[PDB]
């Protein structure tokens, strides 16, 4: 705990790209995106959790 570190443009690109392809992360694509983005698997799992909330919220 904690501390709040925003994700860079490059990381989000990669994360948004895979999400646009499949909303849900696999274990294999998770460890691929980690290597490519240098983000932790945990961070990635969390961003995905939070990204689904957003897609849900934004329906309006």
Partner DNA sequence: GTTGTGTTTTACGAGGTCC
Partner DNA sequence: GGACCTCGTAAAACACAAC
Residue 25: C-alpha distances to residues 18, 34, 46, 52, 58 (Å): 8, 12, 11, 11, 21
Q: Does 7 bind DNA (CB under 7 A)?
A: yes
- CB nearer DNA, residue 34 or residue 43: 43
Binding mask 9-48 for DNA (x = CB under 7 A): ---x-----------xx-x--------------xx-xxxx
Instruction: Point out which residues bind DNA (CB under 7 A).
Output: 1-7, 12, 24-25, 27, 42-43, 45-50, 52-54, 57
């Amino acid at each position: 705990r904690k501390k709040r570190i925003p994700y860079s443009k490059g990381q989000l690109r990669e994360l948004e790209r895979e999400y646009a392809a499949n909303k849900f992360i696999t274990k294999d694509k998770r460890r691929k995106i980690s290597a490519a983005t240098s983000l932790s698997e945990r961070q990635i799992t969390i961003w995905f959790q939070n990204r689904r909330v957003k897609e849900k919220k934004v329906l309006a």
